[PDB]
Design a protein around this ligand. Structure first.
Ligand SMILES: [Mg+2]
Ligand SMILES: [Mg+2]
Ligand SMILES: [Mg+2]
Ligand SMILES: [Mg+2]
Ligand SMILES: [Mg+2]
Ligand SMILES: [Mg+2]
Ligand SMILES: [Mg+2]
Ligand SMILES: [Mg+2]
Ligand SMILES: [Mg+2]
Ligand SMILES: [Mg+2]
Ligand SMILES: [Mg+2]
Ligand SMILES: [Mg+2]
Ligand SMILES: [Mg+2]
Ligand SMILES: [Mg+2]
Ligand SMILES: [Mg+2]
Ligand SMILES: [Mg+2]
Lengths: 176, 322, 392, 45, 236, 117, 101
RNA sequence: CCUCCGCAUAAGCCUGCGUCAGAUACUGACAAUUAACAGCCCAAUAUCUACAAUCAACCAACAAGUCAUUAUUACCCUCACUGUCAACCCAACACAGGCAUGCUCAUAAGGAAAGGUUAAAAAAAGUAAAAGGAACUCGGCAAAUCUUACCCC
RNA sequence: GCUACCUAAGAACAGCUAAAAGAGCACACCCGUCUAUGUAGCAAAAUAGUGGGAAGAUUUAUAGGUAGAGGCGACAAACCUA
RNA sequence: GCUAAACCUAGCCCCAAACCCCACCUUACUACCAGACAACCUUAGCCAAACCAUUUACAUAAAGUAUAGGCGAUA
């Protein structure tokens, strides 16, 4: 029912609503996959209720009662997602040895920068895909000068940072 | 800029909103060879007639029911002409447009350089009834003009936009299906076919089981009000010259299997605020719950044909001017 | 001279790398890279085909492998076939003898004043005015709108005679009805797949017009040939077809007997609109096709002289001009060029009205021609009503 | 009389100075590279 | 530029084909020919200049019927819709070509000379010497390329060896294999030469933009040049 | 003339505005007449469990012991799932123990991942 | 779900199922008068109205009759001290009409 | 009292006189534009498609023209996504300029030339003018009337 | 994205005289003859009046094309982002 | 006595050392359909020669030497 989008009617208007601690990753790791699946929707309903409270508080130009529980719920959901992702990653590594769920490859783009191109799902092979063939994954010789220039810009920035750090350290040592 | 009112509408509870826009009160109810011919039309459009191209569900309505309703109207008119002399001279129109433009209520412009200025709420109905019958002699009033009914017209507490309803600025048309020069200016019956988007199955899937009757009722109210208002304004009446006699019309709205019957009496064209401030008149729409003409069609046989529905159609066609 | 210029023709693939030509070594291509690079050899990708069947991305098998492909070419006449020689070509194809003017049997059905509709002139004028001026909100309705409307309104006006003729309750006006009929002429396999216009369908067959003596007399008549134009011109040559005689309805259908094929040329554009001769030829061919389908259904697929000739009427129109046809099929032995021949009575270019003025023409602020039809000819509607009443 | 030489139209804008057109030719690729080297927040138009 | 020639149709047809003007611009987009641009929109009618093109599965001489003679926007001469067997095609109409006429196209070179009849196509070797011809082919089966404008008529001068000598409308002589086909008579619209434009607007309608306003000095080329007639152009 | 503002479907002519979306994943395709055919299998089906009797509230009691974080690893999962069976059958064909040579043929293929979340 | 690659569907394939939904919605007070049966939500931009219908019917068991959506444009007019425009995020607004009256 | 207008669509722009609160058509917050209108389309392989438009009927044409399928094979089983606000765009500006289309053809819609006073010169716009009527001036420029005839190109 | 020309497919042209007209008067629309004002202006070329065309070699919306040793040009050394 | 005045560190310069989730080439930041299209080719000119036309530079020491060069500017 729509009443699940709002806090308890008794809690309505309360300046402060007491809440427990956010779920921890270690605590969640002990729960079964079905238990985590159910807790995900429990936390999702709580998160929807708290976001509703936040938006209504903004509308009414009033502080949200106990704003910290929204952060607690977000942290709990993040921990649950991390636990599920850890389990999926472990299973994937065991069964296939792949450390990434999505296929990809290190490729040199048209600008000469090495990127991790993440493969997309297609129904036809790449040699037939027209748009993919239009996309270019190689850098022509004229890009080498710009690659060198970018490298030198990065080197200058790094040198400035390091020299400034050394200057500040020397000033600190002299002061103390 | 004016709200475009769609008779066949996906909007929920659109019947009440149309009742408000029209000042209409809805009332439940009404104020052998033919069976063979109806079954013949059904079987012609379902089984007998060979289709070169495969028929898909999304086009089943257009390629089955629409020819079926056309055949029903034509054959029934031909067969009932002996029993209804006026029906002989009547003009039968297929998908001829029916346009009605009117003004109902006022609104303060919310925003813009015209904010705070009073502006009339204009509505335009552009219907395309699958079939319709037009005559030269007006039908008799179903109930005397100034018929006071205790039921109160629904009121809308929000803007018409909130019901899915959008404004446009195009030609304002008042059209009965033929130009004013056509002698056959009064209406007799409108046969409407609901579109595929408004299928009973689709509504059931969308959890709109309560809205089948709403769809039929809204289509009836809108289409019949537009037709009667167009007839009245062809006769010369308008908001400041409200009709001196009721303008009657009938409609049958079908989804292909389920039929519903509606009778509409226009008693008021004074829908604007100025002309409605002290107007006791209110239009009336009698309607019946949708009933299935047949249960199912298996190959060469139609199961559970509804003689009551067929006789309802026959009675509407047999209604005559006085 | 070859049509299609090189710049528009598909570009030739670039020449293969010499690494492929060299026998003993395996070329290094960018296939492993999964993308093109200009400094590696171009892969030779094996042909690809999606494993599963996918509509919306489906390629048909090459034509010769279609199950219905046949070396013998069937020439099909459909709703959008415009014969070059027109009436002569249709008569040769259908093995028909032409008679100018409708038969006396049908023409006399309107001579008696009782069959005459009350206020024929006024009612037909009203029908024309509604079709051409009052039909829609548009100031000048187009042919695509006023041709079907005028035909339907005339049919309704005729149907109003149910009071006088109760036999008119045994007929219906079916739409979207399509028929198919095949036959041989001089070893040429000709099919007619007629669709489009409306079909009046009766519960009883139409009475024969011509007598057996006239049918025999048709033997002496010789089909007018035309050279070098072949009778096949303008007919769709088709090598992938199915020889079948279909009446368009399942067996047991009420109102089985065709009575009038109402054909309408509702194209707005003159080039897209049939010429009068081509429309008459189309009427001939569709009437012959319906009659032949009826004959094949009734007396079987036997090439023989029909003991009970099949009569089919047809009314072609363009909204203003009409053409009336009564076709008597009295023989299914079409292959032979000699013998008894079908016969068609034709009345051509019967114009219901000379012109219609949607707007009042004004010269020097003076109305020269008022709004409405000009040159109305009630004789055309009398012929229309005669055809409608025939058989009742 | 003058001054209003810019008659905006997004189709022309993107077809004249868009990312796709800039990458179409090697010169435009170098234009994009120059913008990247300078640190422009808007490489293309 | 992205110019693509509109002449991409591969299958012959009778329907007028929707053209695309060039304005004298090459495929690169630059003006290659001046004075071309605008004019009334036109549709191309595919002309079958190979008059002897026996229909598929057929061979030998064949006749055809002239359905109509029609003005052609793309050509000085008017065309004719000629239909034979189970096909139709556009051809170049001769002077006295009316609808309903019969046109014979043959590849037979008889020992004697065929009685020349205007509008029919015969091998040049089959024509009597001195007959007026048009739509001549450079090579056997190449297709008509010469004497195609309105009112143009070539002359059959000699038939030495297996070759025929043709006086072109420019009076140049042309040696072609006698097997190459040419139609009898002069091209239609003979009065095209006496057409008065009347107004610059009609030139613009036809699609000819006005000449450049820049003034050019006339060089040595300008003076009237009287030259001997060029030698025969041979294709054997 | 605005280059620093994000390109959205609200900018451009009718064609641009209609063509560009807002990231919503497609649900079906378009056929002749612009009719949209929606494929049910392309609509994400929320697999919502039965929460009746569930004892895990969104928050955790503050009176709960604190435990060190031990992120799950492939080695730990193998030890806790496969190692016991391996030991038992060694004291007494890895598919019997659980290894799957290929992800093909599974509804939920681990790589390339073919399931949501 | 959002910010996840949807497994590509081919004809005859299995149903697309999401187990841990990533969409989080807000029930907001309408800023204008609305019908009694209408509920206003603020939705992630990647959520379709079909997705919202299934979301409400499965997670909350709310009988949904109709759903409409619109993309509200957040103001980009505001500027910080550096004269750089501050973009108010755009958000999707969904109007849900309840069923069974 | 004015009304060139105005209302919509297109294009452009992108929240840019909605509410609340602070300041002193600004700032911050809150809200909003809901699809039917429009965009976003089409399974192949061949094969068809001479006969303008102009009320399309006479006629008259020339500059020769926007508007069509069939045959077989596939295929239905399941209404998404996006635009929707404004006093608005291009001209550095709340710029007397530029700005496509449909209706309204003077309006039902949209607006205010005067911040207040005085009524000097000079200046701008306009109206009236005794008698004369080009005597002005390079020239009847301007204004007023409606006005002949002859040349050059 | 102005402008010169061109390509694709569009749109506009009241009323009157005449009659199938690069016809006449005349709106919209395009242009810019002459005068006045303005000259840091309302305007980096405008305003008011006046005037030329206004069914055509017309005007014009959209998209595309021709690029500087160049393009385009009814040659004004015109126009090609003031 | 108002506008205002000042201020010290944000950083920078030169060296040494040392080598450096999802979306996005279609209208970029756009889940999801038969491609074929692919890069390489002398710098020139200003300027100096008082013009300009051949010509005109791009560790130490040998040495500004041998040589080149409108045998001259210079190299
Ligand atoms: Mg422009
Ligand atoms: Mg000259
Ligand atoms: Mg929407
Ligand atoms: Mg003022
Ligand atoms: Mg003052
Ligand atoms: Mg005076
Ligand atoms: Mg003087
Ligand atoms: Mg004088
Ligand atoms: Mg003087
Ligand atoms: Mg003057
Ligand atoms: Mg005019
Ligand atoms: Mg003129
Ligand atoms: Mg000059
Ligand atoms: Mg000069
Ligand atoms: Mg020098
Ligand atoms: Mg010096």
């Amino acid at each position: 029912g729509l009443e699940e989008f709002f806090d308890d009617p008794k809690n309505w208007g309360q300046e402060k609503v007491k809440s427990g601690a956010a779920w921890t990753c270690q605590q969640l790791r002990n729960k079964s996959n079905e238990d985590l699946h159910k807790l995900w929707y429990v936390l999702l309903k709580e998160r929807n209720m708290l976001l509703t409270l936040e938006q209504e508080a903004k509308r009414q130009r009033l502080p949200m009662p106990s704003p910290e529980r929204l952060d607690k719920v977000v942290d709990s959901m993040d921990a649950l997602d991390k636990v599920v992702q850890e389990r999926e990653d472990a299973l994937r590594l065991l069964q296939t040895g792949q450390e990434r769920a999505r296929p990809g490859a290190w490729r040199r783009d048209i600008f000469g920068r090495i990127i991790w191109h993440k493969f997309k799902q297609w129904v036809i092979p790449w040699h037939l895909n027209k748009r993919y063939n239009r996309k270019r994954f190689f850098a022509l010789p004229y890009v080498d000068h710009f690659l060198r220039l970018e490298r030198e810009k990065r080197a200058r920035i790094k040198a400035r940072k390091e020299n400034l750090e050394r200057k500040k350290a020397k000033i600190l040592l002299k002061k103390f | 800029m004016k709200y475009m009112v769609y008779p066949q509408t996906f909007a929920l509870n659109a019947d009440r909103w149309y009742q408000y826009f029209t000042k209409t009160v809805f009332l439940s109810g009404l104020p052998a060879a033919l069976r063979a011919v109806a079954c013949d039309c059904l079987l012609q459009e379902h089984f007998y007639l060979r289709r070169r191209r495969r028929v898909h569900r999304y086009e089943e309505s257009e390629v089955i029911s629409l020819p079926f309703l056309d055949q029903l109207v034509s054959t029934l008119v031909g067969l009932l002409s002996p029993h209804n002399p006026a029906l002989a001279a009547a003009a039968l129109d297929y998908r001829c447009p029916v346009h009605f433009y009117w003004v109902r209520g006022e609104e303060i412009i919310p925003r813009g350089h015209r904010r705070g200025r009073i502006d009339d709420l204009r509505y335009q109905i552009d219907d395309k009834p699958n079939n319709q019958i037009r005559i030269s002699k007006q039908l008799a009033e179903f109930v005397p003009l100034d018929y006071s009914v205790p039921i109160e017209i629904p009121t809308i507490k929000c803007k018409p936009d909130k019901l899915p309803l959008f404004k446009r600025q195009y030609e304002n048309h008042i059209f009965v299906g033929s130009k004013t020069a056509d002698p056959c200016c009064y209406g007799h019956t409108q046969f409407h076919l609901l579109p595929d988007k408004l299928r009973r199955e689709r509504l059931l899937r969308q959890n709109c089981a309560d809205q089948i009757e709403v769809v039929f009722r809204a289509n009836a109210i809108a289409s019949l009000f537009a037709w009667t208002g167009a007839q009245a304004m062809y006769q010369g009446f308008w908001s400041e010259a409200d009709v001196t006699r009721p303008f009657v019309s009938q409609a049958v709205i079908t989804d292909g299997k389920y039929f519903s019957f509606f009778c509409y009496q226009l008693n008021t064209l004074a829908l604007t605020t100025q002309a409605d401030q002290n107007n006791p008149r209110k239009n009336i729409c009698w309607g019946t719950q949708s009933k299935p003409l047949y249960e199912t069609i298996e190959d060469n046989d139609v199961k559970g044909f509804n003689d009551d529905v067929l006789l309802q159609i026959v009675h509407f066609l047999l209604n005559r001017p006085k | 001279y070859e049509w299609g210029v090189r710049s528009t023709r598909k570009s030739e693939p670039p020449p293969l790398d010499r690494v492929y030509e060299i026998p003993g070594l395996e070329p290094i291509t960018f296939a492993g890279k999964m993308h093109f690079v200009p400094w590696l050899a171009r892969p030779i990708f094996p042909p690809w085909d999606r494993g599963y069947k996918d509509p919306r991305f489906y390629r048909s098998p090459p034509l010769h492998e279609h199950p219905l492909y046949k070396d013998q070419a069937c020439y099909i006449f459909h709703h959008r076939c415009r014969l070059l020689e027109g009436v002569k070509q249709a008569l040769w194809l259908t093995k028909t003898k032409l008679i100018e003017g409708l038969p006396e049997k049908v023409l006399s059905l309107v001579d008696d004043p009782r069959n005459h509709i009350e206020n024929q002139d006024e009612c037909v004028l009203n029908v024309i005015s509604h079709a051409r001026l009052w039909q829609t909100t548009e100031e000048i309705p187009k042919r695509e709108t006023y041709c079907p409307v005028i035909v339907d309104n005339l049919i309704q006006l005729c149907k109003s005679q149910i009071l006088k003729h109760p036999s008119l309750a045994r007929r219906i006006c079916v739409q979207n009805s399509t028929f198919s009929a095949t036959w041989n002429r001089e070893s040429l396999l000709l099919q007619v797949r007629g669709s489009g216009g409306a079909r009046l369908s009766t519960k009883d067959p139409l009475p024969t017009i011509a007598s057996r003596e006239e049918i025999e007399a048709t033997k002496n008549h010789v089909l007018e040939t035309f050279y070098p134009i072949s009778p096949i011109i303008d007919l769709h040559e088709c090598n992938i077809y199915d020889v079948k005689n279909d009446t368009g309805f399942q067996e047991g259908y009420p109102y089985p007997y065709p009575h009038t094929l109402y054909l309408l040329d509702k194209a707005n554009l003159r080039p897209h609109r049939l010429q009068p001769d081509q429309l008459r030829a189309k009427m001939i061919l569709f009437a012959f096709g319906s009659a032949l389908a009826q004959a094949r259904l009734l007396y079987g697929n036997d090439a023989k002289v029909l003991e009970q000739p099949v009569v089919v009427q047809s009314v072609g129109t363009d909204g203003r001009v009409f053409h009336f046809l009564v076709f008597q099929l009295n023989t299914t032995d079409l292959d032979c060029n000699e013998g008894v021949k079908n016969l068609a009575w034709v009345d051509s270019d019967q114009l219901l009205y000379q012109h219609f003025w949607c707007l009042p023409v004004i010269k020097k602020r003076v109305v020269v021609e008022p709004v409405g039809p000009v040159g109305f000819k009630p004789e055309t509607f009398r012929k229309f009503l005669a055809l409608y009443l025939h058989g009742a | 009389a003058r001054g209003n030489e810019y008659q905006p139209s997004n189709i022309k804008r993107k077809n004249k100075h868009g990312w796709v057109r800039r990458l179409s030719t090697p010169a435009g690729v170098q234009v994009i590279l120059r913008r990247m080297l300078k640190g422009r927040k808007s490489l293309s138009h | 530029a992205n110019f693509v020639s509109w002449k991409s149709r591969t299958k012959y047809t009778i329907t007028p084909v929707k053209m695309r003007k060039s304005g004298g611009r090459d495929h690169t987009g630059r003006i290659r020919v001046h004075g071309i641009g605008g004019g009334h929109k036109q549709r191309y009618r595919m002309i079958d200049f190979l008059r002897f093109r026996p229909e598929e599965t057929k061979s030998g001489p064949f006749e055809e019927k002239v359905i109509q003679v029609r003005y052609d926007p793309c050509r000085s001469a008017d065309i004719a819709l000629v239909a034979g067997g189970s096909r139709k095609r556009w051809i170049i109409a001769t002077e006295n070509m009316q609808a309903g006429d019969t046109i014979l196209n043959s590849n037979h070179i008889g020992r004697m000379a065929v009685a020349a009849r205007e509008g029919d196509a015969h091998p040049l070797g089959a024509l009597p010497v001195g007959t007026l011809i048009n739509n001549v082919e450079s090579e056997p089966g190449r297709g008509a390329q010469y004497i195609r404008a309105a009112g143009t008529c070539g002359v059959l001068l000699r038939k030495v060896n297996g070759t025929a000598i043709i006086q072109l409308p420019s009076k140049r002589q042309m040696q072609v294999l006698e097997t190459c086909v040419a139609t009898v008579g002069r091209v239609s619209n003979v009065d095209h030469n006496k057409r008065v434009i009347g107004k610059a607007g009609r030139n613009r309608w036809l699609g000819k933009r006005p000449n450049s306003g820049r003034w050019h000095r006339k060089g040595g080329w300008a003076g009237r040049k009287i030259r001997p007639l060029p030698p025969m152009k041979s294709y054997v | 003339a605005d280059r620093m503002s994000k390109w959205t479907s609200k900018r451009g002519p009718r064609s641009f505005r209609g063509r560009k979306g807002r990231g919503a994943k497609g649900i079906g395709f378009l056929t002749s007449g612009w009719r949209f055919v929606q494929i049910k299998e392309m609509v994400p089906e929320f697999v919502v469990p039965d929460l009746t009797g569930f004892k895990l509230k969104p928050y955790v009691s503050y009176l709960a012991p604190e435990s060190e974080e031990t992120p799950l690893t492939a080695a730990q999962l193998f030890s806790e799932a496969v190692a016991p069976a391996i030991e038992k059958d060694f004291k007494d064909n890895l598919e019997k123990y659980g290894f799957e040579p290929t992800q093909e043929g599974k509804l939920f293929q681990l790589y390339p991942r073919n399931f949501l979340r | 779900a959002r910010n996840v690659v949807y497994p590509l569907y081919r004809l005859g394939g299995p149903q697309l199922r999401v187990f841990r939904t990533n969409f989080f919605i807000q029930l907001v007070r309408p800023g204008v008068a609305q019908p009694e049966d209408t509920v206003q939500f603020r939705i992630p931009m990647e959520m379709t109205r079909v997705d919202l219908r299934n979301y409400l019917e499965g997670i909350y068991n709310v009988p949904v009759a109709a759903v409409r959506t619109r993309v509200q444009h957040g103001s980009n007019k505001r500027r910080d001290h550096r004269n750089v425009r501050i973009k108010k995020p755009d958000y999707k607004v969904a109007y849900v009409q309840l069923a069974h009256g």
